[PDB]
Design a protein around this ligand. Sequence first.
Ligand SMILES: [Cl-]
Ligand SMILES: [Cl-]
Ligand SMILES: [Cl-]
Ligand SMILES: [Mn+2]
Ligand SMILES: [Mn+2]
Length: 180
Amino acid sequence: DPMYEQFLQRIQAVRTATVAKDISADILEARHDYFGRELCRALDIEYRNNVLLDEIILDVYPGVNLMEYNVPHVTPDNYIWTGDMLLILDYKVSVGHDSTEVTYKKYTTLILPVMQEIGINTEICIIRANPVTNQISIVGEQFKRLFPTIPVELNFARFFELRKMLLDKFADDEEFLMMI
Ligand SMILES: [Cl-]
Ligand SMILES: [Cl-]
Ligand SMILES: [Cl-]
Ligand SMILES: [Mn+2]
Ligand SMILES: [Mn+2]
């Protein structure tokens, strides 16, 4: 209720391409966070949204001296510390694979080396929902083993409705069309 209403109020009032581009980005981020909350609820795991990598290391290995290592200050969405293995999690909502590939490449090359020097067994997990079909795709073998079914009940229609109204309001706007 209040989330939808707040976006609606903003789409009603917006007059300029630059402000409209920020509403569009905000809707896409709210849709991403919605999926993350529903995913963690369905799997009964702790819901987080952007944890600094140093803070993840400190939680799994409290006796670490951060200064001895070169820790990239990335903020993956969430993680699962099982006591023997660390699953780095990032949520995606997208009909395509490109954003998954980008994030997979970044976290693989930036997180795995320092986790290997520290000695923490780590897997990069990316969980994507298709907002149109509600189908879930998972990169991450240990995550699939731990969670062979994902009993989520997803409904992205309201996020599409809001963004479509925004795009209809600016369908004749050259500038906004380019800020695509
Ligand atoms: Cl405006
Ligand atoms: Cl103006
Ligand atoms: Cl990041
Ligand atoms: Mn994030
Ligand atoms: Mn994400």
